[PDB]
């Protein structure tokens, strides 16, 4: 239930993970600043080795679609 425990499985498709992430966070009780920061922080930090590598590589300015396409696979 905690957004903090939303973690991507080794074989779990990225888009599956981001889906679980987005839906936990929307129902999460927090301010808007925090949610941005959780999005900017946890999403990358909780991803699997490879998707973490690919995301950190794109940068904080990366867009969700950029992230989707790169991790598609």
């Amino acid at each position: 239930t905690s957004i903090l425990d939303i973690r991507q499985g080794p074989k779990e498709p990225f888009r599956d993970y981001v889906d679980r992430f987005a839906k936990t966070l929307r129902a999460e009780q927090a301010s808007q600043e925090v949610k941005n920061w959780m999005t900017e922080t946890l999403l990358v930090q909780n991803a699997n080795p490879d998707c973490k590598t690919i995301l950190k590589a794109l940068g904080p300015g990366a867009t969700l679609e950029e992230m989707m396409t790169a991790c598609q696979g």
Binding site: V18, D19, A22, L25, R26, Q32, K35, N36, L64
Partner: peptide, 12 residues
């Protein structure tokens, strides 16, 4: 991305 990026894609 930002929280706003997740709301546009997955919704509120």
């Amino acid at each position: 991305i930002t929280f706003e990026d997740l709301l546009d894609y997955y919704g509120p």
